[PDB]
Amino acid sequence: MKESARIAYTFARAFLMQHAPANDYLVTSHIHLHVPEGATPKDGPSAGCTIVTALLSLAMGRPVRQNLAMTGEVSLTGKILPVGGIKEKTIAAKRAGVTC
């Protein structure tokens, strides 16, 4: 998770300068962050795209679109890679009614 965290910090910096150059949030603004514990470390990279979705969400300040959740690994470029255990994830996600 430290690898996913700083890899996401950098790519978020990169994505902000790539997309909205006038903004300078991720390149210069201190940010404490917290991620709830509980998941197995092997799937934790799956959360990294969520991490970026949070960081950029605060960056712009725009609230995330309601009733959706995403999971996936990142490699400082934004590409996603496979994550296991999907049969249990989808049922436990459905019990809460998430649809996206």
Partner: protein, 50 residues
Amino acid sequence: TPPGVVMGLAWTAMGGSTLFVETSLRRPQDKDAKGDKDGSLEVTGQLGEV
């Protein structure tokens, strides 16, 4: 074999197999332009102590 990957022979428990060793930068090098920090590796693939 684009750079950072290559086939590598392995004498498995029975026969052998062309296991592809994979290597890649995992977190950006540029933690600081002035930073002297080493590139510590985080091995995977059921690492032994030796």
